[PDB]
Design a protein around this nucleic acid. Structure first.
Ligand SMILES: [Mg+2]
Ligand SMILES: [Mg+2]
Ligand SMILES: [Mg+2]
Ligand SMILES: [Mg+2]
Ligand SMILES: [Mg+2]
Lengths: 55, 100, 117, 51, 88
RNA sequence: CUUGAGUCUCGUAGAGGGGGGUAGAAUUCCAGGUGUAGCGGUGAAAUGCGUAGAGAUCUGGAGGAAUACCGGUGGCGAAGGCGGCCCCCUGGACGAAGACUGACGCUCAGGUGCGAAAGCGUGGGGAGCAAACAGGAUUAGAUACCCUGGUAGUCCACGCCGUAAACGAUGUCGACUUGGAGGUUGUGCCCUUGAGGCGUGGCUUCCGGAGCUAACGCGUUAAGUCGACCGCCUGGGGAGUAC
């Protein structure tokens, strides 16, 4: 998570639709969620992850 | 100076200049007394979403040390040079060697 | 006619109406069914039990081409988003990839106010 | 959203992604934005988000 | 702010005594510096109605602490300002 | 002289600010194919758009604005207010050890600066929304609510206006006075030997105790008990109007 290249252990947090899952469903400890969401978003821009299923 | 972690995706159909390309970079850090404590040449890789045609690119890590001025030049040369599409250049992030 | 066997059929479910357009494989019309032009409309239309009749009505106005297996594409919260589908799984049509397209802007446009009834 | 699952039948399952979009994410929009109305309700529902 | 490598320098030049961050001589210099630098920065944008506040907060202290000298040891006041040309 | 306040060192989180690039989703428009008698809208309707081929469906292109999920009683800021991503310049806050300064502080009429939204000037910009306005509808009437359209504006750069239920309707600083559960963010420590067990700070919600209060309620983030300084109130309408 600390990075984005972690595409492997990253998609796990994001849903099928590419949408990042909250916490009441995960519990990735808020403090880390910050780095999580930021990492994912900035990553999708590198084609490492799809902005959404459709495209 | 300062640490970095740039990442560019070169068109697969032009994956031949990728090697020579890295050179300019490696040199644009030599005389600048900078350093490259990383270099993950991901090479080819399927693209999640299509970026103006083509579902694959050529990823090449970086992580330099040279001052901002020089690295800035890379951003400019990256643009005009259509050999590479999307890019990204973050700062220090406390130098990271190998792995990733 | 052309004989495709493998085609699609998007469902446009609008809060007031719904139209079933059975497209080919690369996106080509082949017959469109409309809830409005189903011999009924107004408060009678819109409803599932009604707006669906249009969907299955495609058969006697689409199957003329000859199709078997096919996927489905839903787009619209209209009161038929689902009802319409059942008619397909009962009219003889097979079934395959059922995906929802329904658009959702990542907060870009700005919808109109109104609605002060 | 995607669906394939073989095995001959037609039960439903149209409730999978359903509970993650539907006329919900839609109803969420369509009409004028809330601007300030959310900061209140979205933060007023919490009053119940406790008891 | 000023490079960590900077403050540690000025201090050893103005600090009343060898390596000391507290006296006016050191206080002022350390302040005037960031003030002179930011001047250029502000010559750009000039719309940062926030960063500018800090510029004031610290500047308002410059004339402020500078008074301490008068109210106290005046002998140095003039000897300190004559260094950065401040006050004028 | 050092506990107030301040500097140095090292780190900590964040939508704090200004600038410059960039990304994907969607609407609108334009273009081309497919295909045909409807679409759109409403309580119904009608105006409007359709055979000059719309709508839908698919392919290509242009452009503007906004940044879904995350996201939250979450965070940052003096307040106003501030959300994709990246870079550059830059403000504040906070914790850790000490080191240094040595009352250098608090408040503040006047004075100076910042100011939501609308609005104003100059030049740009214009997709969506929409004052004005024009139709359609409702009605006894309907200069409205509703529908179809739609200009200013909303966007940008510079300059101006300075107002708001600018609201916690609660000036700032400091000192104290039972506690309970949660949030968030530093740091010390415990088979760390777990997620965790025990401390100590910064900010923050809900509850409530003595007390305070006309009551509602406030209750260590007070409306409790004290102090320093400032702003203001003195029946309602006339009127925040007139000169
Ligand atoms: Mg209207
Ligand atoms: Mg605050
Ligand atoms: Mg304005
Ligand atoms: Mg104007
Ligand atoms: Mg209470």
């Amino acid at each position: 998570e600390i990075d984005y290249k972690d595409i492997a252990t990253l998609k796990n947090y994001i849903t099928e639709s590419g949408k990042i899952v909250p916490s009441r469903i995960t519990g990735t400890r808020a403090k880390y969620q910050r780095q999580l969401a930021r990492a994912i978003k900035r990553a999708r821009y590198l084609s490492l992850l799809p902005y959404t299923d459709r495209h | 100076m300062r640490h970095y972690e740039i990442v560019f995706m070169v068109h697969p159909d032009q994956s031949e200049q990728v090697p020579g390309m890295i050179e300019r970079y490696t040199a644009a850090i030599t005389g600048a007394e900078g350093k490259i404590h990383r270099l993950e040449d991901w090479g080819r890789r399927q693209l999640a979403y299509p970026i103006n045609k083509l579902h694959k690119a050529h990823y090449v890590l970086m992580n330099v040390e040279a001052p901002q001025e020089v690295i800035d030049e890379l951003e400019t040369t990256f643009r005009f040079n259509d050999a590479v599409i999307r890019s990204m250049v973050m700062r220090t992030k406390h130098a990271v060697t190998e792995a990733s | 006619r052309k004989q495709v066997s493998d085609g699609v059929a998007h469902i446009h479910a609008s809060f007031n109406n719904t139209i079933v357009t059975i497209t080919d494989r690369q996106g080509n019309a082949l017959g469109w069914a409309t809830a409005g032009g189903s011999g009924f409309r107004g408060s009678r239309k819109s409803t599932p039990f009604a707006a669906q009749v249009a969907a299955e009505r495609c058969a006697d106005a689409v199957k003329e081409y000859g199709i078997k297996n096919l996927e489905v594409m839903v787009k619209g919260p209209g009161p038929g988003r689902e009802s319409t589908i059942r008619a397909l799984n009962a009219a003889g049509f097979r079934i395959t990839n059922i995906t929802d397209v329904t658009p959702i802007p990542h907060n870009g446009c700005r919808p109109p106010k109104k609605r002060r009834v | 959203i995607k669906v394939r699952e073989n095995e001959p039948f037609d039960v439903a399952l149209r409730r999978f992604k359903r509970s993650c979009e539907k006329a919900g994410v839609l109803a969420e929009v369509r009409r004028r934005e809330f601007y300030e109305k959310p900061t209140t309700e979205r933060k007023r529902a919490k009053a119940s988000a406790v008891k | 702010s000023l490079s960590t490598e900077a403050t540690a320098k000025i201090v050893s030049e103005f600090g009343r005594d060898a390596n000391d961050t507290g006296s006016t001589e050191v206080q002022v210099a350390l302040l005037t510096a960031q003030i002179n630098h930011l001047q250029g920065h502000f010559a750009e944008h000039k719309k940062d109605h926030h960063s500018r506040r800090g510029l004031l907060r610290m500047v308002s202290q410059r004339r402020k602490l500078l008074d301490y000298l008068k109210r106290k040891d005046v002998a140095r006041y003039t000897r300190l300002i004559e260094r950065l040309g401040l006050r004028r």
